[PDB]
A = this chain, B = another copy of it.
Amino acid sequence: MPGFYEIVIKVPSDLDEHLPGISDSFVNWVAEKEWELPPDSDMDLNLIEQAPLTVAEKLQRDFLTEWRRVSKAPEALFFVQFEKGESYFHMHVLVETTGVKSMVLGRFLSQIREKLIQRIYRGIEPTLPNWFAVTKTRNGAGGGNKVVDESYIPNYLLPKTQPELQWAWTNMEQYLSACLNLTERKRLVAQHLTHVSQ
């Protein structure tokens, strides 16, 4: 089975310490974009933010479009998950490694970061510590890219629920009902635990 990558995206949450010299048009366009909830979900109307989700969905859509334009393959699997943190809001992704190798991944990631800066931030570099970086295999000096197998999502992304879990955009067929429903996620976690117990 083809491997997957893990790219963490940090979403800011301040205007007087994270985005210096911000404009009124950006916040006016962000705040004027409300969202609703599907009837086949199980979330809360007060535990889900608006502007952070609105910018996270735009960032993930821009990343997906950039990946589809670079790899020239619209049928690319992805699994984005916005998980609430204590210091800064983080978002994980599971992009397949079909096409892109590993040595050229650095230049592609740099170009994606530059495009996201010139698009969302309109050419403004935030002062967040390593807000756009990738993980490695934790070696010494010059470690390779960390790969993601199948036994990684049900042990680090599925058990994460409220209030940590915010929104999960899937693409697989066996995860259409386990995106916003906690019962399907718990069933999948139990199935994985019973499978790995053999």
Contacts and interface: CB of A to CB of B under 8 A. Distances in A.
A122 interface: yes
Copies in the complex: 4
Contact of A31 (B101, B142, B143, B144): B101
Contacts of A27: 103-104, 107
27 contacts: A12-B103, A13-B142, A14-B106, A14-B142, A15-B104, A15-B107, A16-B107, A17-B106, A21-B123, A22-B107, A23-B118, A23-B119, A24-B118, A25-B118, A27-B103, A27-B104, A27-B107, A31-B101, A31-B104, A49-B101, A51-B101, A52-B103, A86-B139, A87-B142, A87-B143, A88-B142, A122-B122
Given A27-B104, A31-B101, A118-B24, A139 B15 contact: no
Interface in A35-71: 49-52
Mostly helix, strand, loop or mixed at chain A's interface?
Answer: loop
Contacts of A86: 139-140
A64 to B, nearest CB: 18
Given A21-B123, A23-B118, A123-B23, A103 B142 contact: no
Interface in A5-33: 12-18, 21-25, 27, 30-31
